[PDB]
Structure formats: structure tokens, C-alpha cells
Amino acid sequence: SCIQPGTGYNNGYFYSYWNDGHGGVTYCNGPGGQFSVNWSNSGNFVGGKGWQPGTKNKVINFSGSYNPNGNSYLSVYGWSRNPLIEYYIVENFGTYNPSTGATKLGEVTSDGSVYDIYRTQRVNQPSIIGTATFYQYWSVRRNHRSSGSVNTANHFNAWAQQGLTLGTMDYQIVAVEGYFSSGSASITVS
């Protein structure tokens, strides 16, 4: 049940698995909302399960184990169109906080922790519509965890309040991302 990069449906859940071609990643779909990633000296990859399209008030439940060795994130992750936005609600990470050096755009309290909100910009980078320049929105959880519930409405509403607006939702997953690192993870979404 370990697969090549691509998208599709498995046991009722959308999945997306993408990598940059470097090697060193094994992504597998399991029963229900379960997926696993095992990686060793990878390149950049993103994989996980959820919904296509996402919604603007989904309550996302996740549980499992997340053991990065190096640069990696565990997040609710997805995109909007018109405007094109790549967004993250980061529940845990490895050696790098993705908001390092980014402009802080507020705080929001949700699901047992304060999160710090940031906006960054990707310039002429790959996206769901091709090479583009686009903003990323981040909520970064202060209290890291690998199980819990994410009320996306609290984040999307706080972002909107701050002027970080989302267009129409594309996919919305619980994703393990790695950038040239190693690790293992096993996550069940619902």
C-alpha cells in the first residue's frame, strides 16, 4: 500500500503525496484515514490524507506518532484558489520553525494552545496552478503535539480578520512534510 507520488482516494479519504525526485521517501496508505511516511536522507516531500475540496470550518482530528530527524513539519495543510494561497496550521516540527524570520500577523487561541500567525511569500515557485508568486499563511502552535483536534474555522477566521483572505478551497490534508531530512511518522486522520 506504498505508492508513487500522486493524488487519489484511499478508504474514503483524499490523499496527496508529492516529492521532488531526490529519493529516500516511502509513503503508504493504510486503513481508514491512516497513512505512514518513512524517510532517510530525503529531498523535499509532502504527504498525507484528508479532503478534496477542503471546507472553511472543518474540524480535523488526528492521532499518531511523528519522529522527524531534521527539517520536517506536521500540519493541517492545503490550498486556496483565487487568491492562490498555500496554508499551514503547524502542530509540530523538527529542527526548523517555518516562521523563522517571517512577519508576525497576530495570535489565535485554539484547541488548547496559542498559535502565532505569519505571512510569507513564495516567488516564482511551483504551485497547484504552475509556477507562481503567492502568499503562504501560517498558524504555528506554541505547544507541539502529534495528536489532537484542529478547528480550522478559528484559524481561517483569525487570518481573515488580519487581512489574510482565502479564496475557494482546494485540497486540505494532515500532512507530513520533510526537507532533506530523515524520520518516521504514522498518522490517522478523521
100 belongs to a structural domain: yes
Q: Cα dihedral sign for 144, 148, 153, 156?
A: positive
Distance of alpha carbon 106 from the chain centroid: 20
Contact of 115 with 109, CB cutoff 8 Å: yes
C-alpha distances out from residue 175 to 82, 133, 162, Å: 22, 22, 25
127 belongs to a structural domain: yes
Q: Which candidate in 13, 177, 186, 188 is catalytic?
A: 177
Question: Dihedral of the CA atoms 138, 136, 73, 43 (nearest 10)?
Answer: -170
Contact of 144 with 91, CB cutoff 8 Å: yes
Known catalytic membership, residue 91 = no
DSSP for residue 102:
P
| C-alpha grid cell, residue 183 | 524520520
| C-alpha grid cell, residue 20 | 521532488
* Domain count for the chain: 1
DSSP for residue 2:
B
Closest CA to 62 of 37, 35, 28, 29: 35
Please name the method used to determine this structure: X-ray
66 belongs to a structural domain: yes
Known catalytic membership, residue 177 = yes
1 belongs to a structural domain: no
- The rounded distance, in Å, linking the Cα atoms of 122 and 94 is 21
DSSP for residue 128:
B
Resolution in units of Å: 1.1
Q: Which candidate in 27, 47, 71, 86 is catalytic?
A: 86
33 belongs to a structural domain: yes
**What CATH code is carried by the domain that includes residue 164?**
2.60.120.180
Closest CA to 66 of 100, 32, 37, 101: 37
Closest CA to 58 of 177, 150, 140: 150
- The rounded distance, in Å, linking the Cα atoms of 67 and 178 is 11
Per-residue buried b or exposed e for 13-25, using 16+ beta carbons within 10 Å of the residue's own CB: bbbbbbbeeeebb
135 belongs to a structural domain: yes
71 belongs to a structural domain: yes
142 belongs to a structural domain: yes
Enclosing domain of residue 155: 6-189
Q: Which residues contact 94 (CB under 8 A, 6 or more apart)?
A: 68, 69, 70, 71, 72, 73, 181, 183
SS3 of 159, please? helix
